Enzyme design. Structure first.
Site, PDB file in Angstrom:
ATOM      1  N   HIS A 179      -4.177  12.283   1.725  1.00 37.93           N
ATOM      2  CA  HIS A 179      -4.720  11.594   0.521  1.00 37.93           C
ATOM      3  C   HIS A 179      -6.055  12.238   0.102  1.00 37.93           C
ATOM      4  CE1 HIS A 179      -2.253   7.791   1.854  1.00 37.93           C
ATOM      5  NE2 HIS A 179      -1.479   8.842   1.518  1.00 37.93           N
ATOM      6  N   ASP A 218       1.125  12.576  -2.008  1.00 34.19           N
ATOM      7  CA  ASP A 218       1.290  13.122  -0.636  1.00 34.19           C
ATOM      8  C   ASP A 218       1.626  14.618  -0.690  1.00 34.19           C
ATOM      9  OD1 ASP A 218       0.772  10.723   0.724  1.00 34.19           O
ATOM     10  OD2 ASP A 218       2.882  10.209   0.809  1.00 34.19           O
ATOM     11  N   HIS A 275       3.200   8.007  -5.546  1.00 36.98           N
ATOM     12  CA  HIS A 275       2.509   8.163  -4.241  1.00 36.98           C
ATOM     13  C   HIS A 275       3.087   9.345  -3.448  1.00 36.98           C
ATOM     14  CE1 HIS A 275      -0.095   7.402  -0.971  1.00 36.98           C
ATOM     15  NE2 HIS A 275       0.939   7.564  -0.158  1.00 36.98           N
ATOM     16  N   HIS A 312       6.234  14.328   4.825  1.00 38.13           N
ATOM     17  CA  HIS A 312       5.255  15.268   5.419  1.00 38.13           C
ATOM     18  C   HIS A 312       5.972  16.335   6.251  1.00 38.13           C
ATOM     19  CE1 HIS A 312       2.058  13.270   3.488  1.00 38.13           C
ATOM     20  NE2 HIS A 312       2.353  12.090   4.065  1.00 38.13           N
TER      21      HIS A 312
HETATM   22  C1  LIG Z   1      -1.418   7.038   5.743  1.00 39.26           C
HETATM   23  S1  LIG Z   1      -0.257   5.785   5.098  1.00 39.26           S
HETATM   24  C2  LIG Z   1       1.350   6.690   4.990  1.00 39.26           C
HETATM   25  C3  LIG Z   1       2.590   5.762   4.844  1.00 39.26           C
HETATM   26  N1  LIG Z   1       2.506   4.810   5.914  1.00 39.26           N
HETATM   27  N2  LIG Z   1       2.683   5.118   7.209  1.00 39.26           N
HETATM   28  N3  LIG Z   1       2.484   4.006   7.956  1.00 39.26           N
HETATM   29  C4  LIG Z   1       2.198   2.974   7.111  1.00 39.26           C
HETATM   30  C5  LIG Z   1       1.918   1.599   7.343  1.00 39.26           C
HETATM   31  C6  LIG Z   1       1.661   0.786   6.243  1.00 39.26           C
HETATM   32  C7  LIG Z   1       1.337  -0.644   6.365  1.00 39.26           C
HETATM   33  C8  LIG Z   1       1.049  -1.758   6.408  1.00 39.26           C
HETATM   34  C9  LIG Z   1       0.619  -3.182   6.546  1.00 39.26           C
HETATM   35  C10 LIG Z   1       0.315  -3.945   5.437  1.00 39.26           C
HETATM   36  C11 LIG Z   1      -0.055  -5.268   5.609  1.00 39.26           C
HETATM   37  C12 LIG Z   1      -0.132  -5.810   6.878  1.00 39.26           C
HETATM   38  C13 LIG Z   1      -0.487  -7.286   7.077  1.00 39.26           C
HETATM   39  N4  LIG Z   1       0.800  -8.039   7.167  1.00 39.26           N
HETATM   40  C14 LIG Z   1       1.843  -7.720   7.927  1.00 39.26           C
HETATM   41  C15 LIG Z   1       2.845  -8.631   7.737  1.00 39.26           C
HETATM   42  N5  LIG Z   1       2.413  -9.515   6.865  1.00 39.26           N
HETATM   43  C16 LIG Z   1       1.163  -9.163   6.500  1.00 39.26           C
HETATM   44  C17 LIG Z   1       0.333  -9.971   5.513  1.00 39.26           C
HETATM   45  O1  LIG Z   1      -0.349 -10.906   6.300  1.00 39.26           O
HETATM   46  C18 LIG Z   1       0.194  -5.033   7.986  1.00 39.26           C
HETATM   47  C19 LIG Z   1       0.553  -3.708   7.822  1.00 39.26           C
HETATM   48  C20 LIG Z   1       1.655   1.328   4.955  1.00 39.26           C
HETATM   49  C21 LIG Z   1       1.962   2.688   4.731  1.00 39.26           C
HETATM   50  C22 LIG Z   1       2.231   3.503   5.814  1.00 39.26           C
HETATM   51  N6  LIG Z   1       1.257   7.654   3.920  1.00 39.26           N
HETATM   52  O2  LIG Z   1       1.137   7.366   2.555  1.00 39.26           O
HETATM   53  C23 LIG Z   1       1.301   9.040   4.218  1.00 39.26           C
HETATM   54  O3  LIG Z   1       1.230   9.750   3.296  1.00 39.26           O
HETATM   55 ZN   LIG Z   2       0.581   8.892   1.450  1.00 31.61          ZN
END
Ligand SMILES: CS[C@@H](Cn1nnc2cc(C#Cc3ccc(Cn4ccnc4CO)cc3)ccc21)N(O)C=O
Ligand SMILES: [Zn+2]
Length: 299
Positions: A78, A241, A237, A264
């Site tokens: 990002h 990436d 998105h 990725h």
């Molecule tokens: C660097 S990010 C990556 C894509 N990627 N990989 N791992 C990921 C994990 C998540 C998440 C999440 C999350 C959201 C809310 C909560 C709270 N919760 C849980 C259940 N209910 C609630 C509400 O209370 C808990 C976890 C999102 C994107 C992800 N990426 O874009 C790479 O390029």
């Molecule tokens: Zn991403």
């Protein structure tokens, strides 16, 4: 001349790593001509420097991770997207921990941080990599391809396993002018489905995740109170990436990327395949900015 760019000033941000849940301090420092983007782990003794280059990628499961020996910098995609989008050639990125902070889950805060610190044009021609021949990689139903194109264009298709907003796929294509990235791509946040997120959390992953930094899709409905920033935010998105992964070539691309269910891992496979195929690309500079196929915004 299309000139190299760095920051005018040092600027600082703090945040949390989405994967690690760790609080991280981030410093962006101006760098001289032909430095490229170099990451450093300031929390280690000695300090370890990792150039943001395809050869330094060690892991590609759900984010791009740079590795040198046992030292990692996770989630560079990002921040690297923001630098690509603004045309930052030279910068040191200094981190107090093994992960770039997630911020709001897009590149928007990074482009704002950079555009606040100001851009400094430098007295050296910016270097571009031109796609001279088609290069493609496949693995099962997934495909990533470089195609010659006098400009910069990124197309993407994602396949959800169920219907979201009553369809199974999203497609987007962005033909970049100076302004396309900031307006149409930079704000596209990362996303997860509730059942996947529940699994990631069970295995102690996504420890920094929340509605504040990720779109949470429960079934076919967005849980985030304010909803989506773009109709096609999810596929935008994946374009974000891909631009971040493409910047690991270490030079701005002149050509087209197309992703079909790419991520990725396959994006990184494409980069390694292109780098190996030296007849498919060539480094070029533009002494006349008016005849160049790509424009950047004024600094
Ligand atoms: C660097 S990010 C990556 C894509 N990627 N990989 N791992 C990921 C994990 C998540 C998440 C999440 C999350 C959201 C809310 C909560 C709270 N919760 C849980 C259940 N209910 C609630 C509400 O209370 C808990 C976890 C999102 C994107 C992800 N990426 O874009 C790479 O390029
Ligand atoms: Zn991403």
């Amino acid at each position: 001349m299309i000139k190299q760019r760095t920051l005018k000033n040092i600027i600082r941000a703090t945040g949390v790593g989405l994967h690690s849940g760790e609080k991280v301090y981030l410093t962006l420092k101006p760098a001289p001509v032909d430095t490229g983007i170099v990451f450093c782990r300031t929390d280690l003794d000695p300090v370890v420097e990792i150039p943001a280059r395809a050869e330094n990628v060690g892991e590609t499961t759900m984010s791009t991770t740079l590795v040198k020996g046992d030292v990692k910098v996770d989630t560079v995609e990002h921040l690297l997207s923001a630098m690509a989008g603004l045309g930052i050639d030279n910068a040191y990125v200094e981190l107090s921990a093994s992960e770039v902070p997630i911020m709001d889950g897009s590149a928007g805060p990074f482009v704002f941080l950079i555009q606040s610190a100001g851009l400094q044009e430098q007295e050296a021609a910016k270097k571009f990599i031109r796609i001279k021949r088609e290069v493609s990689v496949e693995e099962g139903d997934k495909r990533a391809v470089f195609v010659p194109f006098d400009g910069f264009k990124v197309s993407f298709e994602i396949d959800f396993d169920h219907p979201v907003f009553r369809g199974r796929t999203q497609q987007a294509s962005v033909d970049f002018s100076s302004t396309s990235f900031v307006k149409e791509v930079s704000r596209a946040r990362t996303f997860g489905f509730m059942r996947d997120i529940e699994y990631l959390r069970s295995q102690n992953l996504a420890l920094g995740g929340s509605v504040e930094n990720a779109i949470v899709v429960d079934e076919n409905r967005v849980l985030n109170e304010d909803g989506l920033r773009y109709e096609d935010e999810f596929v935008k998105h994946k374009i974000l990436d891909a631009i971040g992964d493409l910047y690991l070539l270490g030079n701005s691309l002149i050509g087209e990327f197309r992703g079909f269910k790419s991520g990725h891992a396959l994006n990184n496979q494409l980069l390694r395949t292109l780098i190996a195929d030296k007849d498919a690309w060539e480094v070029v500079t533009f002494e006349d900015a008016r005849t160049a196929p790509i424009s950047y915004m004024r600094p």
